Amino acid sequence: MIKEMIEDFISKGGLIFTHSGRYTNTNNSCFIFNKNDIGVDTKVDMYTPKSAGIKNEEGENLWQVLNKANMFYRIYSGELGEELQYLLKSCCTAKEDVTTLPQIYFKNGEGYDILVPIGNAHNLISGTEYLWEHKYYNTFTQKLGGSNPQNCTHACNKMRGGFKQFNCTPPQVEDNY
Amino acid sequence: MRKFIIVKNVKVDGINAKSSDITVGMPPATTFCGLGETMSIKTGIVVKAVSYGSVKFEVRGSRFNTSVTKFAWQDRGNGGKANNNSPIQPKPLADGVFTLCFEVEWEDCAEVLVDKVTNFINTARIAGGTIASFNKPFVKVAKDAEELASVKNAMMPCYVVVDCGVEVNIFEDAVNRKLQPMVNGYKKLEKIVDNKHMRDKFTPAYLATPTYTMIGYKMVSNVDNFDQALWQYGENTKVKTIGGIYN
Amino acid sequence: TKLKAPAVLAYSRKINPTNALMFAVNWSDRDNTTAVMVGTKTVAGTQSVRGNPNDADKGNIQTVNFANLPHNKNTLLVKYNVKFVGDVFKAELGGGEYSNTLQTALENTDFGTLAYRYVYNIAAGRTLWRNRVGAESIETVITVNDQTFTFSDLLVNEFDEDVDVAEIADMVAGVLSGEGFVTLKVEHYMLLGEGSEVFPSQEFVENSKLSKQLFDLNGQAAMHDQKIGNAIRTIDTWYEDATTPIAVEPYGSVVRNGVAYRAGNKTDLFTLMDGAVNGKSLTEEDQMFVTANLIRGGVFGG
Amino acid sequence: TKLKAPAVLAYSRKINPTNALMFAVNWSDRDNTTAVMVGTKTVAGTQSVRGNPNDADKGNIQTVNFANLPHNKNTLLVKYNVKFVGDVFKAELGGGEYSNTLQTALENTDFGTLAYRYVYNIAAGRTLWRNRVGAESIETVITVNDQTFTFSDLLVNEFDEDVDVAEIADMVAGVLSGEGFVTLKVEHYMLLGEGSEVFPSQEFVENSKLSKQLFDLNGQAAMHDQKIGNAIRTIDTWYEDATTPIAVEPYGSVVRNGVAYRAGNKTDLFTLMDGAVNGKSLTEEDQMFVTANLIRGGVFGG
DNA sequence: GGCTTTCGTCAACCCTTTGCTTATCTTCCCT
């Protein structure tokens, strides 16, 4: 069931987000749902304390069912009901914490803004799925939560093999020339 | 009429290779633009653009995994757990020998400009890495375009960063056209209402998600226009090249 | 009354060492620097894990990165620089109330002993853990502000008094207690012997190919910079039941040995830091410990 | 009440041999040393294999690295440097409780017998593994601290008492029971005969393309340090039904015979160090086995 | 009334194994 799951999520801490500083630091717990970047194939992350939640008859938590066949966009555009839109949006909140997060200065013209860079969840999940699908092996793989990533993030709880990030090494200069 | 100061062979180790969540490796142009505005603050020489190239760069780790850092128990209140190993948050480290070239405008002799840049670099930190060594910086000027290329070829040997733009998104074209992605800036999500836990209480703060552009590495001599390698702070809370998209 | 600490108070690292490039030289020609190359060998042995008597009988094959001296050079040279940076009390994330009252309780830190133990950890060869043993003769050459010193025999587990390390410590304590920076270019000449195996930094990396993967820099054996930073700050002989110097940690915690010597007995960095801020008369040795933590830096969550 | 071992309790190795370069000399011209080159020869024979007798008539072409003495020098020389380091009880990764109680339970260990068997394994030529067969005389020159020690005829399966191996082993046991280090510059002169084929270590290779690939250092035939270290610690005559000395493993396990001489019958090393830590008095050769494991090194936890 | 310590709570993977680029060079001319 799906409503059962959305409410299982809500009895708990109940956060649905597209960006978070939880990937940068597991002690951080800042979860941000941006509205503008939600599209047809936008992967969407969610947080529960210790990734809690019941499974269905096929053994999947809410993170699997909300992320295949564009189900989160289907609930987001209300093809399955406007009261479900409400349930989804009740979990879609912006919780903020700046501790254990990077804080840099970016020039905004005759002044600076303290930007706190938090990582995009759609980038992590969709990039891991795509670069494993499209055989792109110029990459690093990192398990984010540590030994037991369920305290981090539902995607870190389920994708235990590690997230794919880009190997951004430049070409070297050969010294003997 | 353009003026540059070049610091060649900037051996830096301990570089925070975590450029973003999905990019680990060479520090992006936001890092070197931040280094440029850092000297605009400490030394007072106001910097328009920085062209940076990689002589050497190795991410610490294997070809598929980075070497994680053994964390130290430095938070408050978790004594008693300090005997066990500290939990590791992901921060890859790297070493890199760089060549930096700062567009500056200066009105004094080149010796005091070199001394000011040297005194900055002796107290600087490239991407969170201690600057292990660096050659004596030298001043070169770009009066014309041939002189611009003289400055360009004075960074030999280094692989500078040229912007090649975003067609659809980052993953698609990184597989298709095989270019490298890096942070060209950030996107502001929400205003931050709590300035207590920040560096300044008066500087306005935003949560950010890093936007990326797609870039290529070309040797500085093989770059036709040096403006396509000089990154500078654009007015879209991003950074950009002076020459635009490399073609 | 009761000035609380900032939640995310942070300090920058003030002892910044570089990566220790390992070269191969002779005791005769110490100018014949030759990059000790990280080689890769494959190892046949017996698997002997605590719970493996059933599989003890079978073999165990591991590919391991090794680093040995070549058989024509008997001396391991270690290259790094150490940059001591001033402004050790300028917090970059903590506010100007707790950190400044922290600072003004710490001018009475005797920086001379801190600098003496830092330069003695540099000079005695503490940054050379498993290859300072088995060395026939160590020799540390420290070059700073175009002036050069040499140390032959310094015992590493205690800080005995010599005028040369104290003479370097004068300018190091002048930088640390004051402003600016100072840089010591360190040359370790370690007479290990002909073809003796050297010990670079091993990496904390998930590697399917290499069971043991060493740290290389262009293939050349090298040691991690934070490893040498842990070596230089290994000055803490002031914890409870102090026998050997441990690294300056906020909790005095060697997770390598599984023991935290300053945790739970009210002598960690945070209790002494709150005592220094809130006007409690801090001891000289606790003062030097808090100052050494501020020199090391760190973020302090709470 | 039971003191469990630390999960990451590990001991560094204390016998550190170098890679043993092989040269060619004469029994008289030991000053004329020419490096034994590793050549590569393509060799055709029968298919053999225990199964598949249908393809017995087909040939078998394998390319094999060989190492032979030249036909002008009849003596194989093997050079290596054994570094016995001390502090064998300080675990580098487990220092604390268990490790230190093992130390106090192993203070009265007969280090003289362990050092005697180590120096005898160096002196009798056991580090030569398959080179010894066909050698008419094996003369070992061990130079300790500028101390030439000549050995001519020592049987290998038993440790018969002599005065020169014991003379070296006095200060080797002084190093092992105490601190410091000692270096043994070992040369093996073996009258193998004119043009005799010598047997270096062979690399483990999975990419194949060459059936036997010998260990080489710049082309010169050499032996792996691990093989020499296995032969030095081949001192274990204290297992159940002990007939020949075996190498010291935690499980008493050699992998050619596919057995474990000390697993499954409560004299593997983990049970003995658990007994010695928990106040169960070991016998003398039991303590010598546990201390020989600590001298060998390894990791004992989990 | 927080507050700091330690113990209990909640989990579960599908992996792949080098190039990225690839270096700053002589015609006229007259002194």
Side-chain angles (χ1 to χ4, degrees), chain A residues 2-177, chain B residues 1-142 144-145 147-247, chain C residues 2-302, chain D residues 2-302:
Chain A
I2 249 268
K3 209 150 102 55
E4 145 237 81
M5 249 152 202
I6 305 278
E7 284 146 358
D8 146 77
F9 220 79
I10 225 19
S11 74
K12 299 147 165 51
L15 296 205
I16 291 185
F17 56 96
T18 38
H19 314 265
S20 190
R22 187 54 99 111
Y23 315 119
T24 309
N25 205 293
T26 309
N27 300 280
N28 165 239
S29 85
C30 158
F31 311 99
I32 292 305
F33 189 83
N34 194 13
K35 299 211 211 55
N36 304 7
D37 75 306
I38 292 295
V40 159
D41 39 17
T42 296
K43 298 266 151 293
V44 153
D45 213 310
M46 331 184 258
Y47 172 68
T48 317
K50 320 144 186 45
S51 298
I54 53 155
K55 315 285 185 65
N56 42 27
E57 315 103 0
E58 327 72 34
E60 336 166 334
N61 59 339
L62 189 44
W63 188 88
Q64 271 94 60
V65 47
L66 262 187
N67 288 278
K68 28 153 181 53
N70 324 330
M71 168 88 76
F72 189 82
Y73 199 39
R74 194 141 67 242
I75 304 187
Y76 211 72
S77 42
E79 245 309 279
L80 317 171
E82 299 289 325
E83 159 285 349
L84 207 53
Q85 276 224 45
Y86 141 78
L87 238 356
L88 198 77
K89 258 53 106 219
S90 89
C91 308
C92 296
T93 101
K95 194 194 148 284
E96 201 205 10
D97 160 273
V98 310
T99 89
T100 88
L101 271 186
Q103 302 182 36
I104 76 192
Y105 291 84
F106 219 84
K107 176 192 300 312
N108 211 12
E110 71 270 317
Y112 304 81
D113 311 359
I114 301 181
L115 296 191
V116 179
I118 60 178
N120 177 220
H122 158 74
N123 267 342
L124 276 174
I125 304 163
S126 147
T128 317
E129 240 171 43
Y130 179 85
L131 299 184
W132 278 117
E133 148 165 290
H134 266 231
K135 314 282 192 33
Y136 184 80
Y137 299 182
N138 191 32
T139 36
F140 288 125
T141 302
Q142 163 94 60
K143 306 160 205 296
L144 283 183
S147 67
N148 45 2
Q150 70 277 358
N151 39 49
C152 178
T153 285
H154 267 290
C156 307
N157 175 43
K158 305 305 299 184
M159 329 179 32
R160 294 273 176 129
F163 285 95
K164 210 101 155 180
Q165 30 200 144
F166 282 101
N167 185 4
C168 278
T169 324
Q172 306 295 291
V173 169
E174 304 88 348
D175 42 18
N176 285 352
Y177 221 72
Chain B
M1 202 295 308
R2 315 191 71 190
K3 326 169 204 64
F4 300 86
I5 168 154
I6 308 181
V7 201
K8 273 184 63 212
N9 281 66
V10 194
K11 201 216 287 310
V12 186
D13 43 358
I15 284 138
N16 303 338
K18 208 189 97 57
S19 171
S20 90
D21 247 2
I22 62 173
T23 52
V24 157
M26 175 100 169
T30 60
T31 300
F32 295 91
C33 281
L35 172 95
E37 59 92 6
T38 299
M39 27 177 358
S40 104
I41 281 151
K42 324 292 291 313
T43 60
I45 85 184
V46 57
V47 183
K48 312 179 277 317
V50 47
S51 168
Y52 63 96
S54 86
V55 193
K56 309 303 255 270
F57 199 86
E58 314 208 22
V59 186
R60 289 142 90 152
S62 89
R63 74 141 301 161
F64 283 148
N65 289 72
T66 70
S67 90
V68 317
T69 317
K70 291 240 305 176
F71 268 36
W73 280 106
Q74 56 182 17
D75 283 348
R76 181 184 329 255
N78 41 26
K81 315 194 306 185
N83 36 24
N84 320 339
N85 287 70
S86 177
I88 314 295
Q89 313 303 329
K91 34 168 298 182
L93 281 186
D95 309 4
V97 190
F98 300 118
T99 294
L100 326 163
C101 175
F102 309 103
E103 218 147 301
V104 293
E105 60 294 10
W106 193 238
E107 294 332 325
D108 292 20
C109 84
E111 290 40 38
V112 298
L113 168 62
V114 161
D115 201 9
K116 269 169 146 301
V117 169
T118 313
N119 286 23
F120 166 71
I121 285 298
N122 282 316
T123 81
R125 193 97 79 82
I126 307 268
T130 87
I131 298 177
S133 86
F134 62 103
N135 292 132
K136 171 135 170 323
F138 58 95
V139 185
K140 272 181 67 42
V141 145
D144 34 272
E147 268 245 273
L148 180 71
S150 196
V151 178
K152 181 176 65 83
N153 289 12
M155 301 155 77
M156 281 314 316
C158 75
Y159 278 99
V160 287
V161 169
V162 294
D163 199 341
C164 296
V166 172
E167 276 83 342
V168 278
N169 51 316
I170 163 173
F171 316 118
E172 264 268 320
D173 81 336
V175 180
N176 305 333
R177 68 198 202 115
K178 250 325 266 132
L179 249 352
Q180 226 126 356
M182 67 102 144
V183 184
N184 63 336
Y186 302 90
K187 142 179 308 305
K188 309 192 162 357
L189 311 182
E190 338 308 335
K191 182 42 61 182
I192 298 190
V193 290
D194 190 77
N195 45 354
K196 167 147 26 60
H197 311 308
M198 301 230 168
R199 313 171 82 174
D200 314 350
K201 325 196 41 55
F202 35 74
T203 307
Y206 313 72
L207 292 184
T209 280
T211 63
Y212 319 90
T213 191
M214 310 283 316
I215 59 115
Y217 289 114
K218 250 235 168 342
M219 270 282 212
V220 78
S221 90
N222 296 317
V223 182
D224 41 17
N225 193 10
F226 193 39
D227 284 358
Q228 269 145 359
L230 282 143
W231 290 87
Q232 60 159 17
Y233 274 120
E235 195 60 41
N236 209 25
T237 200
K238 296 212 253 217
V239 309
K240 74 181 192 298
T241 48
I242 315 183
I245 303 300
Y246 195 87
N247 285 336
Chain C
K2 274 306 292 313
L3 180 49
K4 284 297 329 288
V8 68
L9 161 63
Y11 280 97
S12 180
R13 173 190 40 225
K14 296 312 171 323
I15 301 171
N16 295 263
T18 84
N19 276 342
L21 278 186
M22 327 208 89
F23 289 87
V25 283
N26 273 128
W27 203 246
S28 155
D29 28 281
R30 254 125 50 179
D31 25 84
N32 279 26
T33 91
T34 296
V36 171
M37 291 318 258
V38 169
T40 290
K41 51 148 162 221
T42 320
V43 155
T46 88
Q47 34 185 279
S48 323
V49 222
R50 192 145 280 258
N52 237 194
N54 18 270
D55 303 314
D57 23 78
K58 64 202 51 193
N60 165 73
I61 311 305
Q62 313 287 318
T63 323
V64 155
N65 263 357
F66 74 104
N68 279 62
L69 286 180
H71 270 85
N72 41 358
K73 324 273 201 63
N74 44 12
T75 308
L76 172 68
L77 156 60
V78 165
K79 304 302 281 323
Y80 56 97
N81 310 336
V82 178
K83 194 196 292 289
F84 295 92
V85 190
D87 251 338
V88 312
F89 307 114
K90 250 193 54 39
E92 60 268 37
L93 197 42
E97 176 59 269
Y98 188 88
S99 159
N100 294 337
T101 59
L102 214 177
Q103 159 165 21
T104 199
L106 287 204
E107 320 329 308
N108 320 309
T109 299
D110 153 41
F111 277 86
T113 318
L114 288 182
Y116 189 72
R117 295 162 115 86
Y118 288 151
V119 182
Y120 194 107
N121 284 350
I122 291 176
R126 170 147 265 126
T127 88
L128 326 164
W129 286 258
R130 214 141 91 84
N131 38 28
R132 72 184 324 277
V133 298
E136 265 66 355
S137 51
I138 329 176
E139 206 162 20
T140 303
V141 171
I142 288 185
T143 297
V144 53
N145 44 55
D146 56 275
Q147 142 194 22
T148 286
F149 327 99
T150 313
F151 322 97
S152 46
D153 284 332
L154 303 181
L155 319 93
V156 81
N157 53 345
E158 82 305 349
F159 308 96
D160 49 7
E161 264 312 302
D162 47 349
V163 80
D164 208 321
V165 183
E167 173 264 0
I168 312 170
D170 292 339
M171 80 206 65
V172 172
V175 157
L176 283 180
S177 66
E179 280 316 358
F181 84 109
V182 65
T183 304
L184 328 179
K185 296 143 74 277
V186 201
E187 306 268 3
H188 285 277
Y189 293 150
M190 318 155 50
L191 192 51
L192 278 171
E194 217 66 61
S196 182
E197 149 167 319
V198 315
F199 303 96
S201 271
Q202 202 190 320
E203 312 220 69
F204 190 157
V205 53
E206 186 251 284
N207 203 349
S208 52
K209 323 245 95 22
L210 284 146
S211 141
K212 158 159 178 271
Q213 200 230 45
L214 285 174
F215 179 48
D216 68 286
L217 239 206
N218 221 31
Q220 180 187 345
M223 302 186 39
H224 290 151
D225 47 354
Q226 75 260 55
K227 193 133 180 63
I228 306 141
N230 188 85
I232 296 155
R233 76 202 199 229
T234 318
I235 73 181
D236 196 335
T237 63
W238 329 301
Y239 53 89
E240 271 287 319
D241 319 63
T243 66
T244 89
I246 70 175
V248 168
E249 286 335 287
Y251 294 110
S253 67
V254 290
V255 316
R256 154 161 291 221
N257 291 327
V259 53
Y261 303 81
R262 282 167 178 264
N265 43 339
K266 277 169 37 36
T267 177
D268 43 50
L269 157 68
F270 308 111
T271 311
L272 299 167
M273 211 165 48
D274 294 358
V277 160
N278 302 353
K280 143 182 307 310
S281 173
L282 218 71
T283 88
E284 191 294 340
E285 273 306 349
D286 295 338
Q287 206 145 39
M288 256 171 28
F289 169 73
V290 173
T291 313
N293 285 266
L294 256 59
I295 284 158
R296 182 205 82 124
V299 317
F300 311 125
Chain D
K2 253 37 193 282
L3 184 51
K4 195 177 26 144
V8 293
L9 162 73
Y11 277 79
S12 156
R13 92 164 73 92
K14 296 311 168 325
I15 299 166
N16 289 257
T18 64
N19 296 314
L21 292 183
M22 322 169 157
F23 296 87
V25 287
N26 279 122
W27 204 248
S28 33
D29 221 339
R30 278 128 171 235
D31 345 284
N32 214 285
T33 87
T34 159
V36 174
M37 292 335 307
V38 168
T40 298
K41 64 183 211 303
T42 294
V43 167
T46 61
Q47 197 118 335
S48 306
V49 201
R50 180 151 217 114
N52 90 338
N54 330 97
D55 47 69
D57 38 13
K58 323 209 295 139
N60 213 153
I61 307 277
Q62 319 274 260
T63 321
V64 154
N65 270 331
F66 76 104
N68 274 63
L69 289 182
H71 275 79
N72 45 298
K73 314 198 123 39
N74 49 358
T75 309
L76 165 70
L77 159 62
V78 164
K79 231 170 292 316
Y80 49 93
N81 291 351
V82 190
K83 212 119 45 104
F84 284 93
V85 211
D87 6 282
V88 318
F89 291 129
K90 183 199 135 302
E92 74 280 343
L93 261 185
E97 260 318 290
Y98 201 90
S99 152
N100 310 342
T101 48
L102 195 51
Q103 171 153 17
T104 60
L106 288 193
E107 172 285 310
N108 46 1
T109 321
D110 209 339
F111 278 87
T113 318
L114 290 181
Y116 177 71
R117 280 159 179 250
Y118 286 149
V119 170
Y120 194 90
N121 275 343
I122 305 175
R126 209 197 280 270
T127 72
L128 328 176
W129 271 92
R130 213 154 147 275
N131 301 299
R132 328 183 81 258
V133 293
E136 159 290 338
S137 39
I138 298 157
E139 167 142 355
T140 303
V141 178
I142 294 188
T143 348
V144 212
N145 359 83
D146 320 293
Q147 260 185 349
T148 302
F149 271 90
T150 17
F151 318 98
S152 283
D153 277 332
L154 307 174
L155 319 94
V156 198
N157 282 324
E158 97 277 354
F159 310 94
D160 36 19
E161 279 328 331
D162 68 87
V163 317
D164 269 1
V165 178
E167 191 169 8
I168 305 180
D170 272 28
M171 81 215 88
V172 170
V175 160
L176 284 180
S177 79
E179 326 302 318
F181 80 106
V182 67
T183 308
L184 273 44
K185 308 270 300 171
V186 194
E187 280 159 287
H188 287 271
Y189 303 118
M190 329 158 53
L191 208 32
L192 270 176
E194 214 82 15
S196 179
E197 153 210 10
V198 311
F199 309 101
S201 295
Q202 164 194 130
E203 321 285 20
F204 202 112
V205 278
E206 309 157 87
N207 287 358
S208 82
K209 166 261 158 174
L210 194 100
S211 165
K212 164 143 71 63
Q213 160 149 16
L214 299 178
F215 177 52
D216 51 355
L217 283 190
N218 314 130
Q220 174 180 14
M223 256 193 296
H224 281 143
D225 27 49
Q226 355 161 26
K227 252 194 132 2
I228 307 142
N230 185 274
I232 290 167
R233 76 194 201 253
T234 311
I235 74 180
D236 181 29
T237 54
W238 327 296
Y239 53 109
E240 182 205 308
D241 314 351
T243 89
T244 68
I246 70 173
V248 169
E249 291 54 6
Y251 278 120
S253 58
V254 310
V255 297
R256 323 161 90 71
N257 314 125
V259 316
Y261 286 157
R262 279 168 160 279
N265 72 16
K266 284 213 331 304
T267 182
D268 53 24
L269 157 80
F270 314 121
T271 317
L272 307 168
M273 64 174 32
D274 278 31
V277 158
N278 299 9
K280 164 182 320 163
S281 180
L282 320 182
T283 49
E284 214 87 24
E285 78 314 344
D286 211 298
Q287 303 174 10
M288 294 190 7
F289 170 71
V290 177
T291 321
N293 279 274
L294 297 194
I295 287 160
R296 158 222 191 260
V299 50
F300 332 107

